[PDB]
Design an enzyme around this catalytic site. Structure first.
Site, short mmCIF file in Angstrom:
data_model
loop_
_atom_site.label_atom_id
_atom_site.label_comp_id
_atom_site.label_asym_id
_atom_site.label_seq_id
_atom_site.Cartn_x
_atom_site.Cartn_y
_atom_site.Cartn_z
N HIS A 142 61.77 36.05 20.71
CA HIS A 142 60.86 35.31 19.84
C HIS A 142 59.47 35.34 20.48
O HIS A 142 58.48 35.69 19.83
CB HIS A 142 61.33 33.85 19.70
CG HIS A 142 60.34 32.94 19.04
ND1 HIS A 142 60.51 32.45 17.77
CD2 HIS A 142 59.16 32.43 19.49
CE1 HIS A 142 59.48 31.67 17.46
NE2 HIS A 142 58.65 31.65 18.49
N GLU A 143 59.40 35.00 21.76
CA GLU A 143 58.13 34.99 22.46
C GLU A 143 57.47 36.36 22.59
O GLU A 143 56.26 36.49 22.39
CB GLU A 143 58.30 34.39 23.86
CG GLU A 143 58.88 32.99 23.91
CD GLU A 143 58.14 31.99 23.04
OE1 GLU A 143 56.97 32.25 22.68
OE2 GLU A 143 58.73 30.94 22.73
N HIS A 146 55.66 37.52 19.60
CA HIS A 146 54.33 36.95 19.36
C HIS A 146 53.31 37.95 19.89
O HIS A 146 52.22 38.08 19.34
CB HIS A 146 54.15 35.62 20.08
CG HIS A 146 54.66 34.44 19.31
ND1 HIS A 146 54.30 34.19 18.01
CD2 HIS A 146 55.49 33.43 19.67
CE1 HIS A 146 54.89 33.08 17.59
NE2 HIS A 146 55.61 32.60 18.58
N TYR A 157 47.26 31.25 14.36
CA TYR A 157 48.28 30.23 14.59
C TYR A 157 47.94 28.89 13.95
O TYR A 157 47.82 27.87 14.63
CB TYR A 157 48.49 30.04 16.09
CG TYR A 157 49.89 29.61 16.46
CD1 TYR A 157 50.98 30.42 16.15
CD2 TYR A 157 50.13 28.42 17.14
CE1 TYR A 157 52.27 30.05 16.49
CE2 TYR A 157 51.42 28.04 17.49
CZ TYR A 157 52.49 28.86 17.17
OH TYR A 157 53.76 28.51 17.53
N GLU A 166 55.26 32.36 13.20
CA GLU A 166 56.47 31.77 13.76
C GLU A 166 57.74 32.38 13.19
O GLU A 166 58.68 32.69 13.92
CB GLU A 166 56.47 30.26 13.54
CG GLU A 166 55.83 29.50 14.68
CD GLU A 166 56.55 29.77 15.98
OE1 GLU A 166 57.77 29.50 16.05
OE2 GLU A 166 55.91 30.26 16.92
N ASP A 226 51.50 19.85 14.41
CA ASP A 226 52.05 21.17 14.70
C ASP A 226 51.18 22.28 14.10
O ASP A 226 51.69 23.24 13.52
CB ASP A 226 53.49 21.22 14.16
CG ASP A 226 54.22 22.49 14.53
OD1 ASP A 226 54.04 23.00 15.66
OD2 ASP A 226 55.02 22.97 13.70
N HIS A 231 55.86 25.46 12.97
CA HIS A 231 57.28 25.54 13.31
C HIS A 231 58.15 24.88 12.25
O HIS A 231 59.38 24.95 12.30
CB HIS A 231 57.58 24.88 14.66
CG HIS A 231 56.91 25.54 15.82
ND1 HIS A 231 55.65 25.17 16.26
CD2 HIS A 231 57.30 26.56 16.62
CE1 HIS A 231 55.30 25.93 17.28
NE2 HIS A 231 56.28 26.78 17.52
ZN LIG Z 1 56.73 30.94 18.43
#
Ligand SMILES: [Zn+2]
Ligand SMILES: [Ca+2]
Ligand SMILES: [Ca+2]
Ligand SMILES: [Ca+2]
Ligand SMILES: [Ca+2]
Length: 316
Positions: A142-143, A146, A157, A166, A226, A231
């Site tokens: 996931h990271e 990005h 973002y 996301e 957020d 998210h």
């Molecule tokens: Zn993320």
């Protein structure tokens, strides 16, 4: 550092044994020279200064509890690199074999992991909410995804573009989990979340609502928390992706699943060819439809399923 490439052995966060690529020069370092310009793993030593020190070990054996997060961050970064290279013909996150750097043991009791625009960072968790985050392959993927997004679409973002950012990371994080065939599912972070509670996860792609996340555009969060719900609203896109791959009927709309491989091909093309920094949900739908069209034809079942999935989640 400059040295001799070799292979060490260690145990990850979940107690599983695995071989990892290291480099020998007096000490054995967590430096993998077999992938692109290399994969480097650092020890942040419970501080917030980055990246810390390149991980050095005296005997090339990583069985200490302190080693676990490093073993997994190093190993899973490699698996993710392999996925992008073998499945999408992409060399590292920038497409030019950029070195992948990760720091573990970031801060104290830190319940998160992130890509900071230059490298990946993993907290150890507080032992209650999370155990070392690098223990989850979907989290690592996931990271790193990005990073891919930053070098391609560049989705801001915030608000809808951030939610897409996301979702893309959850989608590919999950596809990598399936690629590695490591107890694959459509849940996010289940391996490192709440060790004292089985069967749960941070987010669910198959049923976002299970944890209170929206599974339809009409239920989108419009607040400011957020970063505009990046998210939270990702659940709308995650559900669409799940439907495209697995199929199903959602809010009375039926979708014929086309499989994970095609899902990956469609979204990778959308991400690298059509999305822009300010793309919203409606534009993602158009990008996905165009991508499926490019790959399978305007009258294909693939295009039909993409349209049905977005209709099911209310994105026009
Ligand atoms: Zn993320
Ligand atoms: Ca050792
Ligand atoms: Ca799993
Ligand atoms: Ca998972
Ligand atoms: Ca749990």
């Amino acid at each position: 550092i400059t040295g001799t490439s070799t292979v060490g052995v260690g145990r990850g966060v979940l107690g599983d044994q695995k071989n990892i690529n290291t480099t020998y020069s007096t000490y054995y370092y967590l430096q993998d020279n077999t992938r692109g310009n290399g994969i480097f793993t650092y020890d942040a030593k419970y501080r917030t200064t980055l990246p810390g020190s390149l991980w050095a070990d005296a005997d090339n054996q990583f069985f200490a509890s302190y080693d676990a997060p490093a073993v997994d961050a190093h190993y899973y970064a490699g698996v993710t690199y392999d996925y992008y290279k073998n499945v999408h013909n992409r060399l590292s996150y920038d497409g030019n074999n950029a070195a992948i750097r990760s720091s573990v043991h970031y801060s104290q009791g830190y319940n998160n992991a992130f890509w900071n625009g230059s490298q990946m960072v993993y907290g150890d968790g507080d032992g209650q909410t999370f155990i070392p985050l690098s223990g989850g392959i979907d989290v690592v993927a996931h990271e790193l995804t990005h990073a891919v997004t930053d070098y391609t679409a560049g989705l801001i973002y915030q608000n809808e573009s951030g939610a897409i950012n996301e979702a893309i990371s959850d989608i590919f994080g999950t596809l990598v989990e399936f690629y590695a065939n490591k107890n694959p599912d459509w849940e996010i972070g289940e391996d490192v979340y709440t060790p004292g509670i089985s069967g749960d996860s941070l987010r669910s792609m198959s049923d976002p609502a299970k944890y209170g996340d929206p599974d339809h555009y009409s239920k989108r969060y419009t607040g400011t928390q957020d970063n505009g719900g990046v998210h939270i609203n990702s659940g709308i896109i995650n559900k669409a992706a799940y439907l495209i791959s697995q199929g199903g009927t959602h809010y009375g709309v039926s979708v014929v699943g086309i499989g994970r491989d095609k899902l990956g091909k469609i979204f990778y093309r959308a991400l690298t060819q059509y999305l822009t920094p300010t793309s919203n949900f409606s534009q993602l739908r158009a990008a996905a439809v165009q991508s499926a069209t490019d790959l399978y034809g305007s009258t294909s079942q693939e295009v039909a399923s993409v349209k049905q999935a977005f209709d099911a989640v209310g994105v026009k």
